[PDB]
Amino acid sequence: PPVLRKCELPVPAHRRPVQAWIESLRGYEQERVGLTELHPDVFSTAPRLDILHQVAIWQKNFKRISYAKTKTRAEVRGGGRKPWVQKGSGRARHGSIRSPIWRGGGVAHGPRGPTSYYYMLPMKVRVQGLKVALTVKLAQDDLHIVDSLELPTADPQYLIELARYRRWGDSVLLVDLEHEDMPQNVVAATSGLKTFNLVPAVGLNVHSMLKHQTLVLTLPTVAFLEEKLLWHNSRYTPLYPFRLPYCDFP
Amino acid sequence: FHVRVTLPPRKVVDRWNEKRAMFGVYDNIGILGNFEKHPKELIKGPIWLRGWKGNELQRCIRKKRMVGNRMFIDDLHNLNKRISYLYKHFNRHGKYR
Amino acid sequence: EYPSFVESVDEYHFVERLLPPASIPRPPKHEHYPTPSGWQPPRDPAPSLPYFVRRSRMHNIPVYRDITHGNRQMTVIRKVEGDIWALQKDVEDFLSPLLGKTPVTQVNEVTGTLRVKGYFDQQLKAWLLEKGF
Amino acid sequence: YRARPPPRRSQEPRWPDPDDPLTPRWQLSPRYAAKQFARHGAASGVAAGSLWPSQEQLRELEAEEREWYPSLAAMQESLRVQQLAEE
Amino acid sequence: GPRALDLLRALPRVSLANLKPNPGSRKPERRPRGRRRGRKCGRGHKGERQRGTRPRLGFEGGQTPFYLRIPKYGFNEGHSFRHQYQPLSLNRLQYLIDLGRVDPTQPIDLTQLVNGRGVTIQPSKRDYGVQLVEEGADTFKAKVNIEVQMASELAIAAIEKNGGVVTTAFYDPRSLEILCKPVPFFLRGQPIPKRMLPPEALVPYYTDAKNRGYLADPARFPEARLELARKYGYVLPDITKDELFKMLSTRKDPRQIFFGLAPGWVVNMADKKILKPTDENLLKYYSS
Amino acid sequence: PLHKVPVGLWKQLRLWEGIYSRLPRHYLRSLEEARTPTPVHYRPHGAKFKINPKNWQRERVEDVPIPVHYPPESQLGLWGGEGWV
Amino acid sequence: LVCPPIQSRTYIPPEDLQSRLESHVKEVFGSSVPSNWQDISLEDVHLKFSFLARLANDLRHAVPNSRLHQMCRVRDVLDFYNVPVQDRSKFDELIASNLPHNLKITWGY
Ligand SMILES: [Mg+2]
Ligand SMILES: [Mg+2]
Ligand SMILES: [Mg+2]
Ligand SMILES: [Mg+2]
Ligand SMILES: [Mg+2]
Ligand SMILES: [Mg+2]
Ligand SMILES: [Mg+2]
Ligand SMILES: [Mg+2]
Ligand SMILES: [Mg+2]
Ligand SMILES: [Mg+2]
Ligand SMILES: [Mg+2]
Ligand SMILES: [Mg+2]
Ligand SMILES: [Mg+2]
Ligand SMILES: [Mg+2]
């Protein structure tokens, strides 16, 4: 019984959907189980490596808080009096003995307290980065669509053999639709592996997509990503945050 | 300029530990999650620096306003002196004016 | 001392009008084109040219004007998919008789942008409408 | 590995402990209760009659309105007198 | 189309090890290190400039400053109390109607314009709503029940030519914020307040039939419409016998903010319900 | 580090913990309540809103009590609520 | 659950490729053969999937995921299958590309 997936959103007349194979995780040899169509505006956009770099740097940086702090000359313990008189001593003139010139003196500039390197990229830019990551993953033959993400056994060695037989790559990232709906077999199989990482649909990002050589998507995950990413191409600006009720948005 | 005469122990750093494998996994929690949570809520750190960024004077002002009622005596004194020094330097010193 | 209140649902249909849409509605179909505002929808079949100028999210032509340094005037054609070199050739051929010389153009292939030196926004909008984009 | 459960915003109403001295006052002000009722209504557990002003609040509001909002007839009469004086 | 996708097949894997920003996107920072950027580090020789003790901006070295020798004159005097009205061209209104942002089949309100993103109102910046201008009156071919705060005489004439209804109403800042953003107000959990009357400076504007004021005498509306039609040389449409006469003649009470809703009601959007007060004092206060 | 409880609440926590908690409830609430003393050395204004003479606009206006110093010998007599300004 | 040996992914187009394509087109479409059987579109998703899967099983070579949108007609499929695919790398090619006598290369991995 072939499994066939059609695009659920209006495709522009000037672009045709891109076709992809639908594999299965049950058997080693069964690598052609179905056929799916993917929107060109998600899996076939133009590859923007600059946008990919922007999104990857943003992901690496916005969460960073550097807990580095050094005491200035005003925070070092002593140094409250002139060590010697200004004139007559014949040596250099100094004020506090905690000046940056001195041995145990404070740092001139240094790092000052916890510093937050937090900035937020525009939402359309982030969505375009996700789209470009998916597009390059599909173009470089590093994206594989499976169905229901089910496994026969909970042995991580089974996944290792399957990956090395299918030549997926050293690193595999399996994405499922929902966290609580992931089958226990694949959950236990991937709980004991380092290069095989299993994440929900909401946990997909450019950094992990680039970190892992191979991306594995289920059909519901593909539909979810398609619907979530194609919404920003024909949307108004938010009068108030979208968490608030709208006419056509949850 | 004397440099060490022995090989340092080569750090066996792995790129596939839990933190490196799940780094920033939910960075798109909002975009892919029918907005309820901003990526601000994933930032762990000081209370006065979650989802905010500023220069040293603004950071000191925000820290004093937010957690200044729980600071120690010398810490609060140092913060006040740093605020005063930064105010004077930023509003009275420099080249470009 | 809480005052008594009446719980009703009949009047709640007025609250539906007060909910703004999060998406941009598709333009209504008109019996005559162009519309009184000058808007005109794209042709049903795509042209055979080896490039496509995708419409804006508000269903407008992506031709804009840009100013730099206060005196550098430019025209930007965006959302170009296909042979942007062919689009540049067509634009320069169309604009040569108007200026008496080949217009100065810059092509951003990684982005898909044409940048002409000068304000030709309305002329290029009309040209793209006639060409069917 | 397996990813941690996603961070999800709970939809149930939240009520801070009023006996805690460390809880902020903005979470104990009546506006917080009104907003909780607006967000949830049934699950909030707030009596809907508290949203409207009480007797004393209504009296204060009416006094303020009478003092700082003249009636249309009075305002028109004042305008007429002003135009008459200017003429 | 996207030949870059086919080019990417020959290229190796795209990973974090090969990532480059756009050229010219990040100008490299320069530090006072080296022969060229050292030796006073771009500060100059002695004086106040190298030691960073320059005077303020307006200082001219002891001379009476330019920004202080000019006499004070009222230019921004009372700027924070002047009424502001965002302009809305008839051309822009026609563009919105043609693109479907606003439906002419329903009474057009400030809330509808904000939802359609045709105008942006900032009540904190002393905006008092939307005014109508005549910048596109020649090609305006729509019949709408417009509802603005100020209206130009030519814009009114243009709308009445096609057979619409122009009504100018007043909104105090609180009700204006509520109209602009009703959903945040409904999540605020407060009863709908009454609409404050215009001040004495704006009462003549809103009580005259020439401006189509919402507090004006309805008996003088046909006279003003006929005078307008005679002035601008067009026949006044038979609005009464129109199919959409109910939609054209729908009106808001001068103490009413929304359509259908009444002051004092609480809109519980979670349960999709409306709570109405029943106390005599509350009803008298809200209807007074 | 930072204190869990702000320094302002230290006195209230000390009153809540220990023998201070065994005091009668009416006494505890009588000391907890803080009524504003009647104006003595400053004249209060009536309305909460006033018209600015130079701006001709309505503005909110409030009462700021003037600090009064009560010398120790004021506790041995009845000064009527007034002291040293 | 035994692991089959991993294929070398080395594809050499056989002489009977045209006959195999014709037979598979017959077995998939099941209708009368037109005059130009190489110009039939693969628009039908079921037929395209069945044809591609049968070809992959027959020739031990499947179309890559990126080229599925390119595969539109039997002519395109024939063009795809007429080109060989080599798994050996540049070093492997240089080793077997008849190195001169004075050039010695030894693998150190
Ligand atoms: Mg010191
Ligand atoms: Mg000293
Ligand atoms: Mg000194
Ligand atoms: Mg020491
Ligand atoms: Mg030190
Ligand atoms: Mg610009
Ligand atoms: Mg410099
Ligand atoms: Mg620098
Ligand atoms: Mg130098
Ligand atoms: Mg030197
Ligand atoms: Mg000098
Ligand atoms: Mg010097
Ligand atoms: Mg002088
Ligand atoms: Mg504005």
PDB file of N, CA and C in Angstrom, chain E residues 137-207:
ATOM      1  N   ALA E 137     -10.206  62.477  -4.200  1.00  0.00           N
ATOM      2  CA  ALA E 137     -11.647  62.611  -4.380  1.00  0.00           C
ATOM      3  C   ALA E 137     -12.087  62.465  -5.829  1.00  0.00           C
ATOM      4  N   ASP E 138     -11.173  62.617  -6.788  1.00  0.00           N
ATOM      5  CA  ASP E 138     -11.566  62.565  -8.193  1.00  0.00           C
ATOM      6  C   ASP E 138     -11.914  61.145  -8.625  1.00  0.00           C
ATOM      7  N   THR E 139     -11.182  60.151  -8.123  1.00  0.00           N
ATOM      8  CA  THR E 139     -11.361  58.765  -8.535  1.00  0.00           C
ATOM      9  C   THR E 139     -11.981  57.900  -7.442  1.00  0.00           C
ATOM     10  N   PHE E 140     -12.686  58.507  -6.491  1.00  0.00           N
ATOM     11  CA  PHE E 140     -13.343  57.751  -5.432  1.00  0.00           C
ATOM     12  C   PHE E 140     -14.688  57.242  -5.938  1.00  0.00           C
ATOM     13  N   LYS E 141     -14.836  55.922  -6.009  1.00  0.00           N
ATOM     14  CA  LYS E 141     -16.021  55.284  -6.569  1.00  0.00           C
ATOM     15  C   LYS E 141     -16.563  54.223  -5.622  1.00  0.00           C
ATOM     16  N   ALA E 142     -16.671  54.552  -4.339  1.00  0.00           N
ATOM     17  CA  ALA E 142     -17.163  53.618  -3.338  1.00  0.00           C
ATOM     18  C   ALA E 142     -18.260  54.267  -2.506  1.00  0.00           C
ATOM     19  N   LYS E 143     -19.236  53.455  -2.114  1.00  0.00           N
ATOM     20  CA  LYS E 143     -20.358  53.888  -1.285  1.00  0.00           C
ATOM     21  C   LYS E 143     -20.205  53.220   0.078  1.00  0.00           C
ATOM     22  N   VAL E 144     -19.767  53.997   1.071  1.00  0.00           N
ATOM     23  CA  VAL E 144     -19.464  53.480   2.397  1.00  0.00           C
ATOM     24  C   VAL E 144     -20.150  54.347   3.442  1.00  0.00           C
ATOM     25  N   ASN E 145     -20.340  53.766   4.627  1.00  0.00           N
ATOM     26  CA  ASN E 145     -20.818  54.509   5.790  1.00  0.00           C
ATOM     27  C   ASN E 145     -19.600  54.826   6.654  1.00  0.00           C
ATOM     28  N   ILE E 146     -18.876  55.865   6.253  1.00  0.00           N
ATOM     29  CA  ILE E 146     -17.643  56.240   6.932  1.00  0.00           C
ATOM     30  C   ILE E 146     -17.977  56.907   8.258  1.00  0.00           C
ATOM     31  N   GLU E 147     -17.073  56.761   9.224  1.00  0.00           N
ATOM     32  CA  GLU E 147     -17.256  57.320  10.562  1.00  0.00           C
ATOM     33  C   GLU E 147     -15.892  57.821  11.026  1.00  0.00           C
ATOM     34  N   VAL E 148     -15.683  59.132  10.935  1.00  0.00           N
ATOM     35  CA  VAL E 148     -14.399  59.736  11.269  1.00  0.00           C
ATOM     36  C   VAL E 148     -14.611  60.756  12.377  1.00  0.00           C
ATOM     37  N   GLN E 149     -13.544  61.449  12.768  1.00  0.00           N
ATOM     38  CA  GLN E 149     -13.629  62.497  13.777  1.00  0.00           C
ATOM     39  C   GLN E 149     -13.640  63.891  13.172  1.00  0.00           C
ATOM     40  N   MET E 150     -12.886  64.101  12.099  1.00  0.00           N
ATOM     41  CA  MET E 150     -12.957  65.316  11.305  1.00  0.00           C
ATOM     42  C   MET E 150     -13.072  64.928   9.840  1.00  0.00           C
ATOM     43  N   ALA E 151     -13.759  65.762   9.070  1.00  0.00           N
ATOM     44  CA  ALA E 151     -13.952  65.492   7.654  1.00  0.00           C
ATOM     45  C   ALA E 151     -13.837  66.787   6.872  1.00  0.00           C
ATOM     46  N   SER E 152     -13.124  66.728   5.754  1.00  0.00           N
ATOM     47  CA  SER E 152     -13.027  67.873   4.867  1.00  0.00           C
ATOM     48  C   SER E 152     -14.326  68.049   4.094  1.00  0.00           C
ATOM     49  N   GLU E 153     -14.614  69.301   3.738  1.00  0.00           N
ATOM     50  CA  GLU E 153     -15.840  69.605   3.008  1.00  0.00           C
ATOM     51  C   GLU E 153     -15.858  68.911   1.650  1.00  0.00           C
ATOM     52  N   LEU E 154     -14.725  68.919   0.944  1.00  0.00           N
ATOM     53  CA  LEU E 154     -14.662  68.256  -0.354  1.00  0.00           C
ATOM     54  C   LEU E 154     -14.736  66.740  -0.214  1.00  0.00           C
ATOM     55  N   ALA E 155     -14.131  66.180   0.838  1.00  0.00           N
ATOM     56  CA  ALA E 155     -14.247  64.742   1.067  1.00  0.00           C
ATOM     57  C   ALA E 155     -15.693  64.345   1.339  1.00  0.00           C
ATOM     58  N   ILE E 156     -16.400  65.149   2.137  1.00  0.00           N
ATOM     59  CA  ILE E 156     -17.816  64.896   2.381  1.00  0.00           C
ATOM     60  C   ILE E 156     -18.594  64.956   1.075  1.00  0.00           C
ATOM     61  N   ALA E 157     -18.317  65.966   0.246  1.00  0.00           N
ATOM     62  CA  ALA E 157     -19.009  66.076  -1.035  1.00  0.00           C
ATOM     63  C   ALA E 157     -18.748  64.857  -1.910  1.00  0.00           C
ATOM     64  N   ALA E 158     -17.496  64.399  -1.956  1.00  0.00           N
ATOM     65  CA  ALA E 158     -17.150  63.246  -2.778  1.00  0.00           C
ATOM     66  C   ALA E 158     -17.868  61.990  -2.304  1.00  0.00           C
ATOM     67  N   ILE E 159     -17.969  61.798  -0.988  1.00  0.00           N
ATOM     68  CA  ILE E 159     -18.642  60.602  -0.485  1.00  0.00           C
ATOM     69  C   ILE E 159     -20.145  60.676  -0.744  1.00  0.00           C
ATOM     70  N   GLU E 160     -20.761  61.838  -0.495  1.00  0.00           N
ATOM     71  CA  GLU E 160     -22.192  61.965  -0.757  1.00  0.00           C
ATOM     72  C   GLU E 160     -22.513  61.838  -2.240  1.00  0.00           C
ATOM     73  N   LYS E 161     -21.563  62.169  -3.120  1.00  0.00           N
ATOM     74  CA  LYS E 161     -21.801  61.984  -4.549  1.00  0.00           C
ATOM     75  C   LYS E 161     -22.042  60.518  -4.878  1.00  0.00           C
ATOM     76  N   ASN E 162     -21.203  59.630  -4.344  1.00  0.00           N
ATOM     77  CA  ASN E 162     -21.401  58.203  -4.557  1.00  0.00           C
ATOM     78  C   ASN E 162     -22.558  57.656  -3.734  1.00  0.00           C
ATOM     79  N   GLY E 163     -22.927  58.330  -2.649  1.00  0.00           N
ATOM     80  CA  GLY E 163     -24.114  57.944  -1.913  1.00  0.00           C
ATOM     81  C   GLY E 163     -23.836  57.288  -0.580  1.00  0.00           C
ATOM     82  N   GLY E 164     -22.732  57.672   0.053  1.00  0.00           N
ATOM     83  CA  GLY E 164     -22.391  57.182   1.369  1.00  0.00           C
ATOM     84  C   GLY E 164     -22.957  58.062   2.465  1.00  0.00           C
ATOM     85  N   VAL E 165     -22.471  57.825   3.679  1.00  0.00           N
ATOM     86  CA  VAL E 165     -22.835  58.622   4.843  1.00  0.00           C
ATOM     87  C   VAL E 165     -21.557  59.008   5.572  1.00  0.00           C
ATOM     88  N   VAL E 166     -21.395  60.300   5.838  1.00  0.00           N
ATOM     89  CA  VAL E 166     -20.252  60.821   6.578  1.00  0.00           C
ATOM     90  C   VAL E 166     -20.747  61.313   7.928  1.00  0.00           C
ATOM     91  N   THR E 167     -20.124  60.826   8.998  1.00  0.00           N
ATOM     92  CA  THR E 167     -20.471  61.238  10.350  1.00  0.00           C
ATOM     93  C   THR E 167     -19.189  61.513  11.118  1.00  0.00           C
ATOM     94  N   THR E 168     -19.106  62.694  11.724  1.00  0.00           N
ATOM     95  CA  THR E 168     -17.951  63.086  12.519  1.00  0.00           C
ATOM     96  C   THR E 168     -18.323  63.007  13.994  1.00  0.00           C
ATOM     97  N   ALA E 169     -17.585  62.199  14.749  1.00  0.00           N
ATOM     98  CA  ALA E 169     -17.839  62.002  16.166  1.00  0.00           C
ATOM     99  C   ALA E 169     -16.594  62.336  16.976  1.00  0.00           C
ATOM    100  N   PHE E 170     -16.787  62.468  18.283  1.00  0.00           N
ATOM    101  CA  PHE E 170     -15.717  62.797  19.212  1.00  0.00           C
ATOM    102  C   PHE E 170     -15.421  61.597  20.099  1.00  0.00           C
ATOM    103  N   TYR E 171     -14.140  61.383  20.382  1.00  0.00           N
ATOM    104  CA  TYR E 171     -13.709  60.316  21.277  1.00  0.00           C
ATOM    105  C   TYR E 171     -12.673  60.871  22.239  1.00  0.00           C
ATOM    106  N   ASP E 172     -12.955  60.776  23.536  1.00  0.00           N
ATOM    107  CA  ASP E 172     -11.965  61.099  24.546  1.00  0.00           C
ATOM    108  C   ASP E 172     -10.836  60.072  24.488  1.00  0.00           C
ATOM    109  N   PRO E 173      -9.652  60.406  25.014  1.00  0.00           N
ATOM    110  CA  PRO E 173      -8.502  59.494  24.862  1.00  0.00           C
ATOM    111  C   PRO E 173      -8.742  58.075  25.359  1.00  0.00           C
ATOM    112  N   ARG E 174      -9.451  57.898  26.475  1.00  0.00           N
ATOM    113  CA  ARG E 174      -9.693  56.554  26.994  1.00  0.00           C
ATOM    114  C   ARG E 174     -10.525  55.726  26.019  1.00  0.00           C
ATOM    115  N   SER E 175     -11.666  56.267  25.589  1.00  0.00           N
ATOM    116  CA  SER E 175     -12.499  55.565  24.621  1.00  0.00           C
ATOM    117  C   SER E 175     -11.780  55.389  23.293  1.00  0.00           C
ATOM    118  N   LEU E 176     -10.874  56.306  22.953  1.00  0.00           N
ATOM    119  CA  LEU E 176     -10.125  56.177  21.711  1.00  0.00           C
ATOM    120  C   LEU E 176      -9.153  55.008  21.779  1.00  0.00           C
ATOM    121  N   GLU E 177      -8.459  54.853  22.910  1.00  0.00           N
ATOM    122  CA  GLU E 177      -7.617  53.676  23.106  1.00  0.00           C
ATOM    123  C   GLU E 177      -8.447  52.403  23.054  1.00  0.00           C
ATOM    124  N   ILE E 178      -9.624  52.423  23.684  1.00  0.00           N
ATOM    125  CA  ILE E 178     -10.483  51.241  23.691  1.00  0.00           C
ATOM    126  C   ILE E 178     -10.919  50.883  22.273  1.00  0.00           C
ATOM    127  N   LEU E 179     -11.304  51.888  21.482  1.00  0.00           N
ATOM    128  CA  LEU E 179     -11.695  51.643  20.097  1.00  0.00           C
ATOM    129  C   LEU E 179     -10.530  51.117  19.270  1.00  0.00           C
ATOM    130  N   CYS E 180      -9.344  51.705  19.438  1.00  0.00           N
ATOM    131  CA  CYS E 180      -8.192  51.278  18.651  1.00  0.00           C
ATOM    132  C   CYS E 180      -7.793  49.846  18.980  1.00  0.00           C
ATOM    133  N   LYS E 181      -7.786  49.485  20.262  1.00  0.00           N
ATOM    134  CA  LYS E 181      -7.400  48.146  20.705  1.00  0.00           C
ATOM    135  C   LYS E 181      -8.503  47.594  21.596  1.00  0.00           C
ATOM    136  N   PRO E 182      -9.559  47.030  21.001  1.00  0.00           N
ATOM    137  CA  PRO E 182     -10.650  46.499  21.833  1.00  0.00           C
ATOM    138  C   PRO E 182     -10.298  45.200  22.532  1.00  0.00           C
ATOM    139  N   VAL E 183      -9.560  44.306  21.868  1.00  0.00           N
ATOM    140  CA  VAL E 183      -9.209  43.027  22.489  1.00  0.00           C
ATOM    141  C   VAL E 183      -8.379  43.209  23.755  1.00  0.00           C
ATOM    142  N   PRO E 184      -7.333  44.046  23.782  1.00  0.00           N
ATOM    143  CA  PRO E 184      -6.663  44.303  25.068  1.00  0.00           C
ATOM    144  C   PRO E 184      -7.591  44.876  26.123  1.00  0.00           C
ATOM    145  N   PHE E 185      -8.529  45.743  25.741  1.00  0.00           N
ATOM    146  CA  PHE E 185      -9.480  46.252  26.721  1.00  0.00           C
ATOM    147  C   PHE E 185     -10.405  45.153  27.226  1.00  0.00           C
ATOM    148  N   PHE E 186     -10.820  44.242  26.346  1.00  0.00           N
ATOM    149  CA  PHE E 186     -11.672  43.140  26.772  1.00  0.00           C
ATOM    150  C   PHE E 186     -10.931  42.152  27.662  1.00  0.00           C
ATOM    151  N   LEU E 187      -9.622  42.000  27.477  1.00  0.00           N
ATOM    152  CA  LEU E 187      -8.806  41.198  28.379  1.00  0.00           C
ATOM    153  C   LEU E 187      -8.425  41.950  29.646  1.00  0.00           C
ATOM    154  N   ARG E 188      -8.601  43.270  29.663  1.00  0.00           N
ATOM    155  CA  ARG E 188      -8.367  44.060  30.866  1.00  0.00           C
ATOM    156  C   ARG E 188      -9.359  43.753  31.980  1.00  0.00           C
ATOM    157  N   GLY E 189     -10.565  43.300  31.644  1.00  0.00           N
ATOM    158  CA  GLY E 189     -11.536  42.936  32.657  1.00  0.00           C
ATOM    159  C   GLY E 189     -12.309  44.081  33.266  1.00  0.00           C
ATOM    160  N   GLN E 190     -12.483  45.179  32.535  1.00  0.00           N
ATOM    161  CA  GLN E 190     -13.208  46.326  33.052  1.00  0.00           C
ATOM    162  C   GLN E 190     -14.487  46.555  32.256  1.00  0.00           C
ATOM    163  N   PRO E 191     -15.533  47.079  32.892  1.00  0.00           N
ATOM    164  CA  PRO E 191     -16.751  47.417  32.150  1.00  0.00           C
ATOM    165  C   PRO E 191     -16.496  48.529  31.146  1.00  0.00           C
ATOM    166  N   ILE E 192     -17.245  48.486  30.050  1.00  0.00           N
ATOM    167  CA  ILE E 192     -17.124  49.483  28.989  1.00  0.00           C
ATOM    168  C   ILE E 192     -17.553  50.838  29.541  1.00  0.00           C
ATOM    169  N   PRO E 193     -16.717  51.864  29.447  1.00  0.00           N
ATOM    170  CA  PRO E 193     -17.073  53.170  30.008  1.00  0.00           C
ATOM    171  C   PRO E 193     -17.899  53.996  29.030  1.00  0.00           C
ATOM    172  N   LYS E 194     -18.447  55.088  29.553  1.00  0.00           N
ATOM    173  CA  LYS E 194     -19.206  56.022  28.740  1.00  0.00           C
ATOM    174  C   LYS E 194     -18.267  56.904  27.920  1.00  0.00           C
ATOM    175  N   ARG E 195     -18.802  57.440  26.827  1.00  0.00           N
ATOM    176  CA  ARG E 195     -18.035  58.282  25.919  1.00  0.00           C
ATOM    177  C   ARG E 195     -18.168  59.736  26.351  1.00  0.00           C
ATOM    178  N   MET E 196     -17.043  60.359  26.692  1.00  0.00           N
ATOM    179  CA  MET E 196     -17.067  61.730  27.179  1.00  0.00           C
ATOM    180  C   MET E 196     -17.470  62.695  26.070  1.00  0.00           C
ATOM    181  N   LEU E 197     -18.214  63.727  26.454  1.00  0.00           N
ATOM    182  CA  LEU E 197     -18.644  64.736  25.503  1.00  0.00           C
ATOM    183  C   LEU E 197     -17.459  65.599  25.067  1.00  0.00           C
ATOM    184  N   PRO E 198     -17.517  66.177  23.865  1.00  0.00           N
ATOM    185  CA  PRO E 198     -16.423  67.036  23.421  1.00  0.00           C
ATOM    186  C   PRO E 198     -16.352  68.297  24.261  1.00  0.00           C
ATOM    187  N   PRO E 199     -15.173  68.899  24.389  1.00  0.00           N
ATOM    188  CA  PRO E 199     -15.057  70.146  25.152  1.00  0.00           C
ATOM    189  C   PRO E 199     -15.720  71.305  24.422  1.00  0.00           C
ATOM    190  N   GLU E 200     -15.736  72.457  25.099  1.00  0.00           N
ATOM    191  CA  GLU E 200     -16.408  73.632  24.554  1.00  0.00           C
ATOM    192  C   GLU E 200     -15.770  74.099  23.253  1.00  0.00           C
ATOM    193  N   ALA E 201     -14.485  73.803  23.049  1.00  0.00           N
ATOM    194  CA  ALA E 201     -13.827  74.217  21.817  1.00  0.00           C
ATOM    195  C   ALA E 201     -14.289  73.390  20.625  1.00  0.00           C
ATOM    196  N   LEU E 202     -14.745  72.160  20.862  1.00  0.00           N
ATOM    197  CA  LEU E 202     -15.159  71.267  19.791  1.00  0.00           C
ATOM    198  C   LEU E 202     -16.663  71.054  19.716  1.00  0.00           C
ATOM    199  N   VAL E 203     -17.430  71.567  20.680  1.00  0.00           N
ATOM    200  CA  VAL E 203     -18.889  71.442  20.609  1.00  0.00           C
ATOM    201  C   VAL E 203     -19.469  72.111  19.368  1.00  0.00           C
ATOM    202  N   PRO E 204     -19.091  73.346  19.005  1.00  0.00           N
ATOM    203  CA  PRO E 204     -19.645  73.918  17.766  1.00  0.00           C
ATOM    204  C   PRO E 204     -19.349  73.084  16.534  1.00  0.00           C
ATOM    205  N   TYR E 205     -18.172  72.459  16.467  1.00  0.00           N
ATOM    206  CA  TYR E 205     -17.843  71.636  15.308  1.00  0.00           C
ATOM    207  C   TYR E 205     -18.763  70.424  15.208  1.00  0.00           C
ATOM    208  N   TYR E 206     -19.049  69.779  16.338  1.00  0.00           N
ATOM    209  CA  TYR E 206     -19.811  68.539  16.337  1.00  0.00           C
ATOM    210  C   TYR E 206     -21.312  68.748  16.466  1.00  0.00           C
ATOM    211  N   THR E 207     -21.772  69.981  16.670  1.00  0.00           N
ATOM    212  CA  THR E 207     -23.200  70.269  16.721  1.00  0.00           C
ATOM    213  C   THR E 207     -23.701  70.999  15.479  1.00  0.00           C
TER     214      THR E 207
END
